[PDB]
Amino acid sequence: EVETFAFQAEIAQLMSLIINTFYSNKEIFLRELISNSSDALDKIRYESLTDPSKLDSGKELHINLIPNKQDRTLTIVDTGIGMTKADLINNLGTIAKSGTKAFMEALQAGADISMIGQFGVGFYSAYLVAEKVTVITKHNDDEQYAWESSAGGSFTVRTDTGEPMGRGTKVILHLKEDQTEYLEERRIKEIVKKHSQFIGYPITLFVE
Ligand SMILES: COCCCNc1ncnc2[nH]cnc12
């Protein structure tokens, strides 16, 4: 049923830096997530250029932003390439170990947390605002899985039996009590317009 895994030491360490460092400019989190989705959408676009049957699981390539005031969640959905069980376990497709290193050293030499994306670990920026992150994903070559973590040193991976998604990734941010601003329409609009205004995929903000 539910398998539990430990983060590689470097990622436990990244995640603790993101949760504990005093940093007010939390909003970059959305930019990094949206940008992860665009990369996933590139990836499925490219694959499909030579094998059009990869798009059998969904031809539309888009990103949705879904706030929910009652569950206290913001969810970023894309119909990108999605992840296999193995990529999920292996730091969600990232070079997280060396990325954390190159990040760490950028911070020694002048950088700030907003540069996180440049080291291929932007995903973890979700912990700027989320206390728990759930990631549901479906790649063509595999089943649908959910990855989960309230940080703390460990993640879980189960096969997901709820709503079949087709193909792609859903990053559910279970928001911290004091960051409910990121559920506001106006606030999300502001951030998309500020940081993600030239992303090559439609981005729909859902209403409640
Ligand atoms: C490179 O990002 C690392 C974590 C997220 N990686 C991802 N992989 C596949 N589809 C996605 N959709 C959004 N993020 C995705």
Curated annotation (Swiss-Prot):
PTM comment, free text: ISGylated.
Stretches for region Interaction with NR3C1: 1-208
Subcellular localization: Nucleus; Cytoplasm; Melanosome; Cell membrane
UniProt: ATP binding residues: 36, 78, 97, 123
Modified residues (N6-acetyllysine): 43, 69
Assembly description: Homodimer. Identified in NR3C1/GCR steroid receptor-chaperone complexes formed at least by NR3C1, HSP90AA1 and a variety of proteins containing TPR repeats such as FKBP4, FKBP5, PPID, PPP5C or STIP1. Forms a complex containing HSP90AA1, TSC1 and TSC2; TSC1 is required to recruit TCS2 to the complex. The closed form interacts (via the middle domain and TPR repeat-binding motif) with co-chaperone TSC1 (via C-terminus). Interacts with TOM34. Interacts with TERT; the interaction, together with PTGES3, is required for correct assembly and stabilization of the TERT holoenzyme complex. (Microbial infection) Interacts with herpes simplex virus 1 protein US11; this interaction inhibits TBK1-induced interferon production.
Domain notes: The TPR repeat-binding motif mediates interaction with TPR repeat-containing proteins like the co-chaperone STUB1.
Summary of the function given for this chain in its UniProt record: Molecular chaperone that promotes the maturation, structural maintenance and proper regulation of specific target proteins involved for instance in cell cycle control and signal transduction. Undergoes a functional cycle that is linked to its ATPase activity which is essential for its chaperone activity. This cycle probably induces conformational changes in the client proteins, thereby causing their activation. Interacts dynamically with various co-chaperones that modulate its substrate recognition, ATPase cycle and chaperone function. (Microbial infection) Seems to interfere with N.meningitidis NadA-mediated invasion of human cells. Decreasing HSP90 levels increases adhesion and entry of E.coli expressing NadA into human Chang cells; increasing its levels leads to decreased adhesion and invasion.
Family under the similarity heading: Belongs to the heat shock protein 90 family.
Protein name as it appears in the record: Heat shock protein HSP 90-alpha
Species assigned in the record: Homo sapiens (Human)
Taxonomic lineage of the native organism: Eukaryota, Metazoa, Chordata, Craniata, Vertebrata
Protein's gene: HSP90AA1
